[PDB]
């Protein structure tokens, strides 16, 4: 029982602190988008209508 | 941040300090304690994130959405121009159930602020809510779970000719 | 004895020749493999990459621009001295009534 | 704003970390209990900073910091509520869980599974804070059915007992039956108000609130232990001692009363359910002081008293003083607590006996003990200016001027004349008398632990009263004009009851053959509601799932009607076709009628 | 839908081709990483659904049916590689060519644009299905369960073809999307009477409805683990969708056709909810209460309220979870003991310290515990039904203590108590188990986080 959960919490936190550590360090030294009006003229992509950095990236590249 | 129009608030009203009391008020130490711990500190950290958020700023737009023509100018079973519609009333669909958010923020915010008071301090914000719950109402009640804009229509001229009926039959009264 | 039949097989304790055993193989090399393609591609993947992909997924169904959009028509209009909203969906100009 | 409400919520995250630091392993077990005490000891220093702002200007806020789920027009969010009522019970359940955890860290002690106890109680905690800071409906079921299951796996803490196993489901069976009203609250609340938000449901404010409050009531009734599902509340001391002094005496019993308080405004403008909570409290209070007088258990006389007091705040509902009914949660809180903290040391003492018949000669053995015992049942009667006094005679002194069911007023007065029995009872038992224990003396109280723990709520059963009462802000216009008789009945059926008491105390000790009666069987027996509902009511249940559920509907006739005699009919027509003697001479013969009724009957021919 | 159907289809040669003792690590690997892309299907929009050609679409109703599909089946090769350890290779190979079969046939099922297309592999569904019962099965009696199994499903699904195809006569299409602007109001006479039931039968049976259930406590109990897993946790739900989607062409006549089987759900759901309380077979409990659960989702669906098919998407999700975790944890216990009477075993608790918390965490979930989705998708379909009935408070009310009742007196039977003496080969917990349990719990409980992507396309 103990070797299963000290693996359970090795596996997780082998992806989750540096996913915990990388949206840190994206907020603190990236933060979000700003929210503007569309200069006269310009059409946005599509996924220049998202917040979050992570959020916009995902559009961007997958959707 | 954001509209004060839209999520309106009264001024504040603190009264002045007036002690008639030789003992020190333990809250006001224990304030003075709090902004130098924990404001003070805290302040400084938002400082150095925001400076970093300033040397890299970059915007996102609010998405806007042409009108196209609505279902009662779509042909029967033209797909194309009720596919359009119907986004279309799905959209409208949508922000209006916000509005109807918004108008139960700014009636449960008055409630809460107003305390004791309540009762009569929050009537116009209680008026503003049974009206756009009313409009609401006509518009999506009793649709079920597959609403269209179709079904909406005809649930909008079930009630015009019952207006118009009733109208009528006053007439001569 | 009736009918030439196997007699059925003591059943077996993955414990007894590998106290090490993580119940997926008895071969101890494959047994430990079998459990690392769990627990990475299980937890330190999808489980954990896919709540991260969850939680930044762009608007999901919209619901944060109509909140915008909901603030911007409600400050128009009561701006205008104009209702919030209307009981007629359609606009009664362009619908005729039977009769 | 920024003080208010940081303090506010660091408490509900202090007491978390504990659970979370449980995540990660062996962060240090030796040490565990130690450490989940003194985290609650300060989450009661920060709770009482908001306690006092609130005490000093009225300050009271909303905190909706997270969006959840919005369905529709139905936005939920995780909404906390820091005002009067949770602002004065989040210090007193602190101050009381600090107790009971230092209490069990000397209770507790030889336990394997110290840890998973201390766990447990710190999850319950986490749980009625939510339940008290819910500013919606649904935010207060999660802490509604939170306190619950916490309650079951407490109840059924020694687990290979069959009795504590019986009891653990027999709280939740009870619970859920309430549970029922809170469903149908909410079910209409959403319905007619489109909110479970607190906030919209007194700002519209509805006349017709016949159904949700009868609902409330239901759900109050079982989780508050009143009568009709009552009898979970006593069987729930199968639990260990600091279960029964915390969830079952202190704190969990009394969610459905401070549910009831949360709607007042509701409750206050309905006449008629205010007859309903009334009646319902105070047969709940006489009928379960009743069954406390014959009772031989230490810990079933206490249950009984809690249930009896909880029957009490539920007067108090019913007459429309929801403040009085939430100032006796908070005093009751006090020495209730102390006494099963008491019980549990003498029980101790004593090798797990549990029974008032081998108790006795303990008032000198345990002298520390033997104070808080008597200041906590001083407390619970209500003796002047002790903490029980300053909520419990303002409710007999406002239930005697109210137009009242007359009925009601006569019940909540004689159970409180019995409440002064059945107190002496325990003194005269366990106390006074000539040992009745047995040979092999161990009594001892020496711990520090025990000491402590006792002592902070022995202080709190002096002055917890005084100083609340004192402090809280006035919210009615309190009754203080009031013919003599009435301002001092409280006093005068307590004085009646000692006297009472003590004289049938003492004829226990004169050699006169017993003779029982009628009365005193129904009172010990329990009146005889769970030898009969919990027979008869599940040997009809468990019929039905076999009998006709199970056997005669599944495996029978939902058989038959459908595959059985579809394949029989078709297993017989097989054998109609097949079924010949391969002679050609037949075969023949029938394509000649085949044939012949082609042309005659069906004119295939034309 | 071709960036998961190729994927999909390429599990079977990685099985076939793999190493004789690496079948098992492959084909989890792989399938673990296709799982892994199907959350690209979250890319929902707030009016239209995301189609991708005229066969496939995807809208918040077949996402999360989807991802949970996708989702067992690593799960379910890991709760059979045990059993089957001392099978031949050759039928290890196969049995894992059945469930990828099965897997490539619901996710088009789920995905298919076409009301003929989704039949097809609608009914495919059941070859698959039907194999894995019938040979793979562990006692005499799954040769009689797949007779039941295929016989009600055909049954109730044949009048279904001839229903689809008139109507494509007499609309002119089968899309699901064309049907939302070309439908037609169903008027009141005998002809569309039997058109409604036809339309309807088909997915009554699979969820199933009470009275047609009977197929389901033998499937359920004569399958092995990995079919039971799929039984409960997806096949359940073809019944649900379908009648999720066919409903938009049965109105107004859905609004009194309903009765009869609104009235069969609400007393149909106390009935087996008390069956399982005196049931002697832990397998037949969970699958009991299966049928109970489904219930409420045939209520949910017939009044056809926003909040009932938000609630009817929450149940079917949740029960997947649910249901699924409970057939492991019982087959924990059948891989010990070689038996499914709940009484043989008690008292596990005290041998199997880590199992027992798997135990109390999916009677929680089962018994619906607040914030769990479990209770959100109840929630909303009694809030739903409240305002169709105000009555039928009493028998949703009913329901949720005898739900409580057999939930935990399945828990405190097996897990609590003296343990029986003469059982001696309870051995510890294996990783593969506990990793098992975790990997339906943890999602289910991060659900919760998040539960809007499981509401479906009414939120
Ligand atoms: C609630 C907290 C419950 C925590 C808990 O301990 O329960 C399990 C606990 C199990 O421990 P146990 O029963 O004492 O027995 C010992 C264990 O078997 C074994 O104990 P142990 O000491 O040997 O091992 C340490 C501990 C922990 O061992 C571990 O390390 C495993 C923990 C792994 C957590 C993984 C979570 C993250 C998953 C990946 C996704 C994250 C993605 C992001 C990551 C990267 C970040 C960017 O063990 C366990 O907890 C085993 C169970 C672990 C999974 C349980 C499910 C987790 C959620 C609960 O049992 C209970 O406490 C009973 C729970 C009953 C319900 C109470 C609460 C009901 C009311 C709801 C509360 C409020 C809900 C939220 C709404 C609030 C709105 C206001
Ligand atoms: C625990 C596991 C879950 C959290 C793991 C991810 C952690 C991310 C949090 C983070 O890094 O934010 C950085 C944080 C965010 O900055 P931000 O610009 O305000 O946020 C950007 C957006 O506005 C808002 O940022 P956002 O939209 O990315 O929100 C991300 C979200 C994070 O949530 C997620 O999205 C992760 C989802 C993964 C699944 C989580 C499942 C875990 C469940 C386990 C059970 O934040 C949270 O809600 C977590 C906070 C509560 C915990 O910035 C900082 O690092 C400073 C915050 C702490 C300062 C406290 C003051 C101390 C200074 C005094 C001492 C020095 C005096 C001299
Ligand atoms: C309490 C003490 C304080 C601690 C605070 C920590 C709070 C935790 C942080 C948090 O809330 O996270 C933010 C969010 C929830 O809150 P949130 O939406 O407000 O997130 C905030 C961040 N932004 C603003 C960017 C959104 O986390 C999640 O959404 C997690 C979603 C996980 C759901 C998906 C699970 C992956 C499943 C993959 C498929 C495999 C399973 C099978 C599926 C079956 C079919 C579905
Ligand atoms: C051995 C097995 C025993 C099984 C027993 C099952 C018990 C069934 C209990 C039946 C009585 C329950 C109440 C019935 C409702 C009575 C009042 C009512 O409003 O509805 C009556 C209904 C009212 O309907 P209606 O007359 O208004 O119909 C309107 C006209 N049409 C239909 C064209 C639009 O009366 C009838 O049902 C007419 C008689 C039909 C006879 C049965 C037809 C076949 C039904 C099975 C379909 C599948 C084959
Ligand atoms: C980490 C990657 C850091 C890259 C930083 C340099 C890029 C940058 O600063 O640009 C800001 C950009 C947001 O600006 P944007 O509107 O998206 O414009 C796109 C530019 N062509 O932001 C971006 O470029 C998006 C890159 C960050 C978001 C994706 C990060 C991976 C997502 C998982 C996060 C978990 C932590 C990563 C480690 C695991
Ligand atoms: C340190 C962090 C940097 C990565 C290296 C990880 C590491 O140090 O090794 C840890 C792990 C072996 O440790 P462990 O599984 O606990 O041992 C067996 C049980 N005691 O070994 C690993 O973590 C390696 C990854 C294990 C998962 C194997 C399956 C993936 C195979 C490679 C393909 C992945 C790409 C697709
Ligand atoms: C009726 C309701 C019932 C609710 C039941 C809920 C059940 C779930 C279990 C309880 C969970 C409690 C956890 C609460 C703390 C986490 C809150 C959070 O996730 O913050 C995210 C927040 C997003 O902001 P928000 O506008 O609320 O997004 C709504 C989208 N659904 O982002 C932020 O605003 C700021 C986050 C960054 C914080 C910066 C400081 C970092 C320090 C670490
Ligand atoms: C629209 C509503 C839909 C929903 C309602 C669904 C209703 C339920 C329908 C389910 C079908 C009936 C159940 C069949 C179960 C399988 C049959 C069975 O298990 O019975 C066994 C029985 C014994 O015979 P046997 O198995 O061959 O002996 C072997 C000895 N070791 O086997 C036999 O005796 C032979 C059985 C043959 C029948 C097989 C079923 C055929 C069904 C089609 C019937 C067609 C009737 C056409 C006749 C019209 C003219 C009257
Ligand atoms: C067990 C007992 C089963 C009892 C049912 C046995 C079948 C008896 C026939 C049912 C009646 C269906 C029918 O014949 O409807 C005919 C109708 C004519 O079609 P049409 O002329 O083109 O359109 C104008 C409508 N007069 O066609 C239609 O308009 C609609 C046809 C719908 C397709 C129905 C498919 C079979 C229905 C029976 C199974 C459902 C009942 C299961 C219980
Ligand atoms: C246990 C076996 C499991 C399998 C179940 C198989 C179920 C098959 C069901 C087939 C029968 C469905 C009902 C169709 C009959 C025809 C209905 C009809 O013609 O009348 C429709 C009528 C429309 O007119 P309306 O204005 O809406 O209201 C008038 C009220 N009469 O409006 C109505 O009349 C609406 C009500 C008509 C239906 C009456 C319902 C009967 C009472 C509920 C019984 C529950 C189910 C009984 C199952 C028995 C099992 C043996």
Redesign the interface.
């Known amino acids: 029982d103990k070797r299963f959960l000290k693996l359970l919490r090795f596996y997780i936190l082998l992806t989750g602190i540096p996913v915990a550590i990388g949206i840190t360090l994206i907020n603190v030294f990236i933060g979000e988008a700003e929210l503007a009006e569309i200069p006269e003229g310009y059409v946005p992509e599509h996924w220049e209508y998202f917040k979050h950095p992570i959020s916009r990236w995902i559009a961007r590249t997958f959707f | 941040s954001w509209d004060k129009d839209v999520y309106p608030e009264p001024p504040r009203r603190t009264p002045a300090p007036s002690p008639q009391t030789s003992l020190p008020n333990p809250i006001t130490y224990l304030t003075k304690a709090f902004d130098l711990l924990v404001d003070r500190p805290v302040t400084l950290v938002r400082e150095f994130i925001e400076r970093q958020h300033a040397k890299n700023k970059y915007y996102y737009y609010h998405r806007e959405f042409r009108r196209v023509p609505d279902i009662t100018e779509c042909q029967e079973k033209d797909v194309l121009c009720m596919f359009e519609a119907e986004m279309q009333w799905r959209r409208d669909y949508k922000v209006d159930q916000e509005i109807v958010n918004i108008i139960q923020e700014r009636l449960k915010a008055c409630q809460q602020r107003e305390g004791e008071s309540h009762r009569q301090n929050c009537a116009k914000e209680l008026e503003q809510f049974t009206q756009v719950v009313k409009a609401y109402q006509d518009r999506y009640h009793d649709l079920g779970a597959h609403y269209s804009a179709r079904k909406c229509l005809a649930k909008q001229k079930q009630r015009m000719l019952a207006e118009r009926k009733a109208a009528k039959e006053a007439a001569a009264a | 004895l009736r009918w030439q039949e196997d007699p059925e097989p003591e059943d077996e304790n993955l414990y007894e020749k590998n106290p090490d055993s993580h119940g997926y193989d008895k071969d101890p090399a494959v047994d430990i493999w079998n459990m690392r393609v769990v627990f990475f591609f299980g937890f330190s993947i999808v489980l954990v990459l896919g709540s991260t992909f969850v939680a930044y997924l762009p608007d999901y169904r919209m619901q944060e621009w109509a909140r915008r959009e909901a603030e911007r028509l409600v400050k128009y209009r009561e701006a205008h001295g104009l209702p919030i909203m209307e009981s007629n969906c359609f606009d009664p100009s362009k619908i005729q009534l039977p009769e | 704003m920024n003080m208010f409400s940081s303090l506010s919520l660091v408490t509900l995250l202090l007491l978390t970390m504990p659970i979370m630091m449980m995540s990660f392993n062996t962060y240090k077990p030796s040490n565990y209990p130690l450490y989940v005490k003194t985290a609650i000891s300060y989450a009661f220093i920060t709770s009482m900073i908001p306690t006092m702002m609130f005490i000093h200007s009225g300050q009271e806020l909303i905190i909706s910091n997270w969006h959840w789920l919005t369905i529709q027009t139905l936005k939920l969010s995780l909404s906390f509520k820091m005002d009067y009522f949770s602002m004065m019970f989040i210090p007193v359940a602190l101050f009381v869980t600090w107790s009971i955890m230092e209490f069990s860290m000397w209770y507790m002690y030889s336990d394997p599974n110290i840890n998973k106890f201390f766990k447990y109680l710190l999850l319950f905690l986490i749980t009625m804070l939510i339940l008290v800071t819910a500013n919606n409906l649904f935010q207060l079921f999660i802490g509604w059915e939170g306190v619950g299951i916490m309650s079951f796996l407490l109840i059924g803490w020694w687990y290979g007992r069959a009795d504590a196993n019986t009891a653990a489901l027999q709280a939740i069976l009870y619970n859920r039956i309430g549970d029922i009203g809170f469903i149908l609250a909410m079910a209409w609340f959403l319905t007619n108000l489109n909110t479970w938000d607190l906030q919209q449901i007194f700002m519209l404010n509805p006349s017709d609130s016949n159904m949700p409050l009868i609902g409330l009531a239901l759900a109050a009734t079982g989780k508050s232990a009143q009568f009709g599902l009552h009898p979970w509340l006593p069987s729930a001391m199968e639990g260990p001692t600091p279960v029964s002094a915390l969830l079952h005496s202190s704190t969990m019993v009394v969610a459905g009363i401070f549910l009831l308080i949360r709607f007042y405004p509701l409750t206050e403008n309905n006449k008629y359910i205010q007859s309903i909570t009334l009646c319902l409290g105070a047969i709940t209070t006489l009928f379960t002081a009743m069954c406390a007088l014959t009772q031989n258990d230490i810990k079933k006389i206490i249950a009984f008293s809690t249930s009896s007091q909880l029957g009490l705040m539920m007067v108090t509902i019913g007459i429309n003083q929801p403040y009085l009914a939430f100032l006796h949660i908070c005093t009751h809180a006090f020495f209730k607590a102390m006494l099963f903290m008491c019980s549990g040391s003498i029980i101790h003492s004593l090798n797990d006996e549990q029974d008032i018949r081998k108790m006795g000669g303990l008032f000198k053995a345990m002298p520390f003990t033997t104070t808080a015992l008597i200041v906590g049942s001083l407390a619970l009667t209500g003796m002047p200016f002790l903490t029980g006094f300053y909520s419990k005679d303002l409710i007999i002194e406002a239930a005697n001027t109210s137009y009242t069911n007359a009925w009601a007023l006569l019940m909540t007065l004689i159970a409180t004349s019995f409440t002064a029995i059945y107190s002496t009872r325990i003194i005269f038992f366990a106390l006074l008398g000539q040992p009745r224990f047995p040979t092999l003396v161990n009594i001892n109280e020496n711990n520090p632990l025990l000491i402590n723990s006792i002592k902070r709520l022995l202080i709190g059963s002096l002055f917890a009263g005084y100083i609340i009462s004192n402090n809280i802000p006035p919210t009615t216009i309190p009754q203080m004009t009031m013919p003599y008789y009435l301002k001092t009945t409280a006093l005068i059926v307590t004085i009646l009851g000692f006297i009472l008491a003590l004289e049938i105390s003492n004829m226990t000790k004169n050699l006169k053959y017993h003779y029982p009666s009628n009365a005193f069987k129904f009172s010990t027996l329990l009146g005889y509601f769970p030898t009969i509902m919990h027979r008869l009511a599940p040997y009809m249940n468990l019929s039905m799932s076999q009998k006709s559920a199970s056997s005669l509907l599944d495996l029978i006739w939902l058989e038959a009607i459908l595959p059985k005699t579809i394949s029989l009919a078709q297993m017989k027509a097989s054998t109609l076709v097949t079924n010949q003697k391969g002679l050609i001479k037949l075969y023949f013969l029938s394509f000649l009628i085949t044939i012949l009724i082609s042309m005659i009957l069906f004119n295939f021919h034309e | 839908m071709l960036k998961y159907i190729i994927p999909t289809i390429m599990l079977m040669p990685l099985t076939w081709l793999s190493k004789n003792?690496?079948i098992?690590?492959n084909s989890?690997?792989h399938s673990?990483?296709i799982?892994?892309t199907s959350?690209?299907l979250?890319?929902?929009?707030?009016?239209?659904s995301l189609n991708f050609s005229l066969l496939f679409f995807s809208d918040?109703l077949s996402t999360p049916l989807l991802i949970l599909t996708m989702?067992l089946l690593?799960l379910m090769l890991?709760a059979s590689?045990?059993h089957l350890?001392?099978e031949n290779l050759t039928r290890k190979k196969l049995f894992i060519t059945m469930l990828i079969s099965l897997q490539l046939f619901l996710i088009m099922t789920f995905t298919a644009m076409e009301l003929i297309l989704f039949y097809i592999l609608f009914e495919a569904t059941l070859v698959p299905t039907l194999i894995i019962i019938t040979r793979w099965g562990n006692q005499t009696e799954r040769l009689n369960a797949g007779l039941?199994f295929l016989?009600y499903t055909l049954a109730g699904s044949l009048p279904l073809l001839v229903a689809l195809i008139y109507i494509q006569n007499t609309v002119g299409s089968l899309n699901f999307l064309?049907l939302?602007?070309?439908v037609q109001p169903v008027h009141n006479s005998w002809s569309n009477v039997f058109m409604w039931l036809a339309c309807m039968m088909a997915f009554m049976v699979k969820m199933p409805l009470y009275?047609?259930h009977?197929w389901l406590?033998k499937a359920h109990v004569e399958a092995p683990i990995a079919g039971s897993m799929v039984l409960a946790a997806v096949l359940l739900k073809l019944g649900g969708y379908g009648m999720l989607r066919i409903?938009?062409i049965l109105?107004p006549m859905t609004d009194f056709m309903a009765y009869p089987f609104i009235m069969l759900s609400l007393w149909g759901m106390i009935?087996?909810s008390?069956?399982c309380?005196?049931?002697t077979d832990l397998k037949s409990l969970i699958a009991y209460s299966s049928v109970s659960h489904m219930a409420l989702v045939i209520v949910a669906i017939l009044i056809?309220?926003?909040?009932?098919?938000?609630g009817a998407t929450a149940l079917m999700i949740a029960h997947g979870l649910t249901s699924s975790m409970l057939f492991c944890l019982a087959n924990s216990n059948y891989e010990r003991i070689?038996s499914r009477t709940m009484i043989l075993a008690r008292?596990l608790?005290?041998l199997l310290?880590?199992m027992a918390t798997w135990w109390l965490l999916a009677s929680?979930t089962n018994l619906a515990?607040?914030?769990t989705i479990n209770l959100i998708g109840e929630?909303?379909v009694?809030?739903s039904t409240?305002?169709w009935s105000?009555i039928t408070?009493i028998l949703?009310?009913?329901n949720?203590?005898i739900t409580?009742?057999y939930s935990?007196?399945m828990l405190?039977m097996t897990?609590?108590?003296?343990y029986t003496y003469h059982i001696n080969?309870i051995?510890?917990?294996?990783?593969?188990?506990?990793?098992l349990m975790?990997?339906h719990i943890?999602?289910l409980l991060?659900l919760t986080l998040?539960?809007?992507?499981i509401?479906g396309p009414?939120?």
Not at chain 5, 304 to 310: K, L
Not at chain 5, 415 to 418: D, V
Not at chain 5, 427 to 435: K, L, Y
Not at chain 5, 450 to 453: A, D, L, V
């Open positions: 003792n690496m098992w690590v989890t690997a673990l990483l799982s892994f959350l690209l979250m890319n929902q929009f707030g009016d239209n918040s989702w690593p890991m590689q045990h350890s001392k039941y016989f064309m939302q602007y070309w009275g047609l009977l406590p409903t938009l109105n009935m087996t008390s069956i309380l005196r049931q056809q309220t926003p909040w009932s098919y938000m070689h008292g608790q005290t310290p880590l929680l515990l607040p914030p929630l909303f009694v809030m409240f305002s105000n408070i949703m009310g009913v949720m203590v409580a009742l935990l007196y405190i897990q609590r108590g003296k080969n051995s510890p917990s294996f990783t593969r188990e506990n990793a975790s990997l943890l999602p991060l998040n539960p809007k992507i509401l009414l939120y």
